[model samples]
Target chain A: AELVEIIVETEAQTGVSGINVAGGGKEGIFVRELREDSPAARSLSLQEGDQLLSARVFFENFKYEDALRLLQCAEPYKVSFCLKRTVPTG
Target chain B: AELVEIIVETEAQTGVSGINVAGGGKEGIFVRELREDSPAARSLSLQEGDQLLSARVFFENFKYEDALRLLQCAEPYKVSFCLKRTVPTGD
Candidate 1:
């Protein structure tokens, strides 16, 4: 079988680091250059001067179903988180 | 994000059961229809009337680096397998 790759841009809510295939490996597709205004950017809790070590992604090798399985493992249904910073509370 | 699918045909030389994207699963792109002369068809110790039990595919998910880690675990470099049939060799 042949291998095909696709690239697209989506809203940060989609919560996708990258895509991969069943038979593919970690290096298949890489995601970079995220928008600061995106939800991921904001939710990740980035401080000034903080840089991304790396983004999550699946290798594009295996079949569609296999890829989907990997994608679903993250449990995207979970939403909302609270961040706290040290403050002077009297 | 919207999902996009693409299909392509290549020589039988390329060994593939199916493909998946990172965060994908086993059920991803199922591969069916086998050519009698293909290498995979010929090697797996299949018979004329035998059928495929199931195809193996890695779930796609995680980052490219993570997926690569999973793919490499399969060890694609290993080549060749020998199969024997119950033959009446004792003459």
Candidate 2:
């Protein structure tokens, strides 16, 4: 499935620490949670079911650690997220 | 929204060792992953994005650690899961 792109900008000091992710391997990565007060949650563009397809620093065959690294930034930065939502089979 | 009920049975020895969960507090818990070779994966009832509302041992106001403890069973146990899926708002 094709991924939906999302760009998240964060304060230089805060970075992208509002969102939490889990899952990987053949099953793929997914956004597990979003902090209510964080920028990611404020954007209102991401949801719990959004499967993370790729990121600016992490591509195919990436691990959760890799994603974390990509999210870290010292200065204000814009990180792109590629995601896809899983639809129920029913 | 009300939670959906799901029953997961596992062998005493194997237990429910395949699934991983994340998220908590007001946001609630979600199924993060399913091990490809684990019984939880074979059940085919669970999927990523499924919000975990409650468990047999853990009720509302439960933590991720609480859920983990409830999932740990011995001698063949049936654990019930209450979940809800988040739908897109198209806003």
Candidate 3:
């Protein structure tokens, strides 16, 4: 597994990110789904099952609620989503 | 052990941020020293032996040169210094 960090620009007039996440259980938070045609879905960097490390409010150890909450807010431009991705051996 | 993320504002007239660090060896980079009266030294959050996780160039696993170079340039306001600190257990 490799740690990947992505700065995503998720913004809309409605303020709906359309990025769905789950976890924050015994371990960490994970990306579950993304709404089609949404800003989140547009980002190729984001992936389902990707472990969210932080959103620069600096949430880590992967909390589901904190991840979801922080991601919803778009700062001046992009939101940094530090994630852990599981890579397959070549 | 705890993971600490400190946002430091290190700026000077000479653009010299007096934060000195060592490591970037077989494992990770660690803070070795701090310049007195420098912006880095002013931050109470920073300390020697604090493993720098990243300086927001997105460098991790801790590179000494990258850490030092990045700290030299003051962006707009603050720099994020993510470090791993060995905290003493509660007395």
Candidate 4:
């Protein structure tokens, strides 16, 4: 697993990044799915199974829904995310 | 504004129910918005600005995120909501 961080724009109207997540508190939030028709796949390259590290200030340590709500209530556009992606070593 | 209580089903998998909410603590959680394509709009009829309430046995008055967390972490299908709706003063 490699740690990576990126900043991406959220939907202008809803601020949602088109990603669904599961997992929580002390364990960390993990990206469970994505709407490929939207930003997470179309522009941000976010993938399912990416373990969320943080969003903006501090969300990595928060519970699952708290992390998700933080993204849902983001200020219109642009949020920084840190994720741990498990890449297959070929 | 009027207070109401009801039980509705969450999305089978995520339990999201597609309602966005705000407010907190003593202020109480409110229905900030929702996707028209979601359960709140089509089935639950959840309205904007509806202040969430606490019901005995199942629900409690909670902070904004805490309330949202409750809904999100609900069981397979059913959850209860108590709300305050501001409707036109007629009928």
Candidate 5:
């Protein structure tokens, strides 16, 4: 089965925000403009105001090469995502 | 063939460096300690002075999941790197 990746919100303000969550968790790339027709964009569940808290990428101890392989896996499949919706909920 | 990822060095200096290049280009995670005796270490080709200009991590947009997946791919394969060795360019 494919792995589930999750990067956690961090308090470490210097350098890069380290990944704190487990189960294939790691820091996610902060995005400026999410594509309009992409899975992330189509998810009305999310809003532009949201800051990508984390994502479910495969693998562990992330390396440059292996990270690429996992991305390829996503191409032929639909990966699950869990983001922190910026629009506050009551 | 496997895909190649490359996070570029940028001048933006703010809000995560955008992927300035193409073909799986994106930002990279800055590492603190590169494991000893690991590929990065064994290479001996690199020194502590090297400022990893970029890395070959897979995925287009660099979603955390795809990034992790690419990291796994490197477990067995050796990815090529193009770094700016801080040691200087003297002979």
Candidate 6:
């Protein structure tokens, strides 16, 4: 239940536009996909299946769109993330 | 282009039945979803969107179904995997 922290600086020229995130209701927000050659990929910290537990912008009230907005608003600086690694099934 | 190796032991009592995979043609085989409380989920290595480059049983000729079959055949034992991290996109 521990969350992982991920931060990515965005650049207007090369930063990622938007991250494809999924999950709803009881699933929570998960890093579904990211754009190729974007900042997130270059950072190498964010990965698909990493669940977004909360974000700084929205505090603990983070919604899926809030995360997206943070990424969108992070157009030349950075975005912070609170995530949880998806536990594998046995 | 380098692939990551992941291995999971299967148990008839709690082993995962199958994995949900997606991708085709140029997309390659990507992990779509894992059943909760399933073996793959417990393995902690396999995740949604993990690209499956190949598998041990099928070797270099692995297909999507091959991966499924391998998981299906892996009863009370284990399954090995060759995977790749998906590249993030700007789209």
Give the lDDT of residue A90 in candidate 6: 21
Candidate 5 ranges beyond 4 A from true positions: A1-31, A60-90, B1-91
What is model 5's C-alpha RMSD? 21.4
Question: Which portions of model 2 show Cα errors greater than 4 Å?
Answer: A1-14, A57-90, B1-91
lDDT of 4 at A67: 32
For model 6, state the Cα shift of residue B52 in Å.
0.5
Alpha-carbon deviation at B80 in model 3, angstroms: 13
TM-score-better candidate, 5 vs 6: 6
| Predicted structure 3, TM vs. truth | 0.28
Residue-level lDDT tens digits of model 5 in A1-90: 343333323221211212121122233333334455644344333333223432223122344544444444444322322111112232
Top lDDT prediction, candidate number: 4
- What is the C-alpha lDDT profile of model 3 across A1-90, one tens digit per residue? 344454442221122245565544234345578779865566444567655443222222223332222222221112222222222331
Clashing pairs in 3: none
The residue-by-residue lDDT of candidate 2 on A1-90, one tens digit each, is 443444332222213335565554345445688878875576565567665432222122223332222222201111122222344342
**lDDT values of the candidates?**
0.29, 0.37, 0.37, 0.38, 0.31, 0.37
Residues B1-91, candidate 4, lDDT per residue (tens digit)?
Answer: 3443443322222223234656543444555667667634564334565443321111122233432343343322122222222223333
Off by over 4 Å in 1: A1-90, B1-31, B46-91
Query: What TM-score fits each model?
Result: 0.19, 0.27, 0.28, 0.27, 0.21, 0.25
Weakest 10 consecutive residues of candidate 5 chain A by summed lDDT = A12-21
Q: Cα deviation of A58 in candidate 1 (Å)?
A: 18
Q: Runs in model 3 with CA error above 4 Å?
A: A1-16, A57-90, B1-43, B46-91
Query: Stretches of candidate 4 above 4 Å error?
Result: A1-16, A57-90, B1-91
> How do the residues B1-91 of candidate 1 rate in per-residue lDDT, one tens digit apiece?
3443222222222233222222224322332345557654554332232222222222233344444443333222111111111223343
2 or 3, greater by TM-score: 3
